[model samples]
Target: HSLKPWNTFGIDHNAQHIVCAEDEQQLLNAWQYATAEGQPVLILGEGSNVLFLEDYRGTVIINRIKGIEIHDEPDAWYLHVGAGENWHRLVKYTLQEGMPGLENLALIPGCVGSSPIQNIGAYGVELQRVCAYVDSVELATGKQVRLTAKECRFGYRDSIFKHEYQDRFAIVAVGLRLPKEWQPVLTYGDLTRLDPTTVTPQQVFNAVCHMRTTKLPDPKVNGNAGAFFKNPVVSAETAKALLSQFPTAPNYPQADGSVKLAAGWLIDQCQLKGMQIGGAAVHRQQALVLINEDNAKSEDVVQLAHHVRQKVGEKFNVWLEPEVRFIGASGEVSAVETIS
Candidate 1:
């Protein structure tokens, strides 16, 4: 229905009820009504990072609460942002106002509320480092709660919001703290092009913009989710073994004992780039993205993803995990493995 244009994937999925809430009161009202009627509810942000396997039978509440408030502190600045505000715009505002913590996260698609749910990170800076807290309301009781950064238990592309309290809490606002003295992050190799001593947030933002513009296909033009799979993390021993077979695999050593391998590199190694099933194909420009090249159906994407997962598993003995969540027609969440 109308949701096809809403979700970036362009899948034709309909919901029993789809309501867009622009404020906290709207969300509370929807929650109370849904609970009283005993109808299922699906909490949606931008629908940017989710795939509907089938039509949703439950009510889908699209979060639209929007605002940005600045609170000055002696040591740092606290920014309270609404869940519905555009993420990239907020990051740009932060830079314009002399804040630097969000420069590396510039240009990430979706609403601000989706940030803490996924602990979004890019160009070597994780959102968790600057996050203060996540504010939400319980679905059943309509009671408000504040979860500190530590309570979120952020991991690589994950948070408690996505798991422990899945669909149980509605994120209303997010709090982030930026230090009074700004420091530009330069952990990625592309950022090294500039001298760190004179490095500024503007320069870093420009670099990230250039890299993404050249590398990622715009969703408006190409129907696809960004980074279909999370980079696979493996033990040091496993990394050494993979290096023996794929000496050129792009691998990074983490602070912990594990090693992270690039999912794009692994897919490219299998020569899976541009591989297609029905109307869905792995992007020729970027291997990790699964695209709806020519009027694809939901089944086409699932088949294509399953093929990619199987090939990677066979060739390298590594299981790739999807970053996008999948919701079935019954509104039951499914794992990527189910595609196989």
Candidate 2:
């Protein structure tokens, strides 16, 4: 089956087998069948943050397991959601139900099952803060296990699922705990403009949606993954050096003495916006976004990404890391390795 419709990148790679798992049992069955056949299995959510470099030679299991259960507590609202549920839709649903914590993450594309893999974050809040637990089925024995938030080991856009649990377990559900005592997180980006004392959750949600719609190109219009590169975190001394060179450079200090620098700003500083390699081009408005401008091949995106990394590294003495996951012929591969 052609993966063009499945992935946001619209890469026309084909998979040997494709299975849509509408429920947990079907997901398990598809995985087991692939394992029994000694064929590799790759679980995909909405394919919003992935790039397929070549045709997959194994079974591609599309997670479609769908459901949402709410358990309201005196002080918190607990939610258990199936993996296939759309992320932005869920955020809107919670707000409609008078639950208010996911407003900051509005308009993020992808499925809930894929969120924990990168500990998806935007604006000021991250999945780590609201995550209660993650439920998954172990591939080796098909045993379902529930891991607490601590066990997930969530860092900035990172979790154990990307390391120790990679390909070993498939996430089936996620538990979210939103506190009833709502406090607006308004310190990041344009959100700082909102008055913290008077800001409502719905207002926050609307603001986030507006910011995203204006800043990000629609996947339907352009074949692209959101934020091609992650914000590079550098040491304090390095940040100070960059600041000395360019006083207007944006930098955010982390609690651990590290500083996060905007990848978009670095790329823009290099004047890479609208630059292209083959069919892949840097977005004119948002340098962080890379788009398929003209029926691009995977190599076009790869080469363009390498060029971006090279230019930023030469200019700022910092190497940018890819936020998008790259899938090789068999399974997951490192974007860094492929780019290098």
Candidate 3:
């Protein structure tokens, strides 16, 4: 659609063909049409994590299937979500119905189909933790498959969708099992700072929304994805060396002795905060967010990201990888690798 109604970032770009699939059968039909016509098919969810580099020449299929069903068990409830369902809307629905585990992921923008793609996480909970299984269809054979969380191979924000099996399957549904009795997770530093004391799951959800509001500019207002870069993971020794130079740098240690360093901190350290190239700028309040301050071309945004990556690598010897998915550009995909 040329109207830019699909993406929250609201970059104006046109798809050669846009098809809305209301059910699994329709989704399959759309896929077949694109393949039979020799047009590369792109599956669009809520378009929250996507940045359109230019007008797409291929067919774009937007998942429109939406529904929720609950299967009651003794200790938990298995919730089935349609691929097209809004992620944050499902979180709110679960909270209202007294389902606990989804509270920490409140306000995350994207569709349910995209959740397993990245194993989307926030606060201290990941979709992987609550996910029972994912239903998907192979675009090649139109064969249906249900993959468990283990088979999904979630690591950080990495998933099969972004890996060796990229674009091989289209997620049709996701099944999540939440606890019957709620337990709040306040392990994340931000969560602790906001609550500082006892808080319920619902309260945690509200707190998360409030914290995000303070940190992230609403895409509707600012025309940007929440965070453009993934936090760089480095060896513990490397983290120690950097910490000596910048003591306040945030670092989270992994089980494998690697450290996840905040990309925002690194960008700010390189004096890139508020830096602008054309209409794109590093967000003043949050360096991780690259903002389109004006009606910027997608190339302008790409350039700004390049500058941030160059600055961070020059100063810290660590390359920051982009978390935002780029589309409709031939050479731009190489830029992502070059930044790394």
Candidate 4:
């Protein structure tokens, strides 16, 4: 099966088997079938955050499991969303149901299953803030298990799924706990203009949608992942020194006493906007996005990514890590191995 439609990058890689699992039982059955056939299994959720460098030699399971169950409590609403639910639609559904906490995360790409894998965030809010639990099935033993938010060990664009749980479990659903006492988060970027006392969830959602549409190229029109690299986190002393040198550089302070520097700013400082290698180019409007400019090959994207990383590291003395996943012919590959 051609994976051009699956991945946002529009890579034309083929897989040995493409299983569209529509339910939990179907997903597990697909997994067992792949295992029994001595084929490696790769679970995908919309393929928004992954880049396939070559044709997959095994089975690729597309998680189409769909459902949304809302449970109301006196003080909050707990939403159990299937792994395959489109993230944006889920956000809209919450608002329609009178839930407001997800307004700040309205426009992020990918599906519910992939949320906890990287703790997806945009504007000022992150998945870690609303996540109650994650449900998964262990591939090794075919056992279903649930992990509390703390056990997910979420950090800035990271979680336990990227570490010890990598390729060991398939996320089936995500549980979100939204408090009934809604407090609007308007601390980030243009959202600061909205009056906190008077703003509604619908207004915030509209603003976010508008902001995203203006800045980001739609994947259907131009092939690209939303953000190529993560904002580099450094020690407070390093951030202070950098701020002293380049006083206008954007920095966000974390609770752990570290400061996060903007990757886009670093790339822009290097004069890399519109920079290209092969057919991949840095988006002129957003330095963080690398697009498939003119029939780009997987290697083209890889080389462009390497170029951006090198330029940013040379200018800022901070190495930017990829927020996107890289998949090899058989399974997931490390970004360091490919980009470095």
| Displacement of the residue 191 alpha carbon in candidate 4, Å | 1.1
Model 2 scores worst on lDDT over the 10 consecutive residues at 3-12
| Error in Å for residue 122 of model 3 | 1.1
Estimate the TM-score of every prediction. 0.96, 0.97, 0.94, 0.97
* Count of clashes, each model: 0, 0, 0, 0
Sort by lDDT, best first. Answer: 2, 4, 1, 3
Model 3 bad stretches (over 4 Å)? 1-3, 193-198, 329-335, 338-340
Q: Which stretches of candidate 2 lie over 4 Å from their true place?
A: none
TM-score, ranked from best to worst: 2, 4, 1, 3
lDDT score of residue 135 within candidate 1? 91
- Candidate 3 has its poorest 10 consecutive residues by lDDT at 329-338
- Candidate 2 clashing pairs? none
Better of 2 and 4 by lDDT: 2
**Predicted candidate 1 versus true structure: per-residue lDDT over 58-145, tens digit per residue:** 6778899999999999989999999988899999999998877798999988888889988898898888989999999887787889
lDDT of 2: 0.92
Better by TM-score, candidate 4 or 2? 2
- Per-model CA lDDT versus the true structure: 0.85, 0.92, 0.84, 0.90
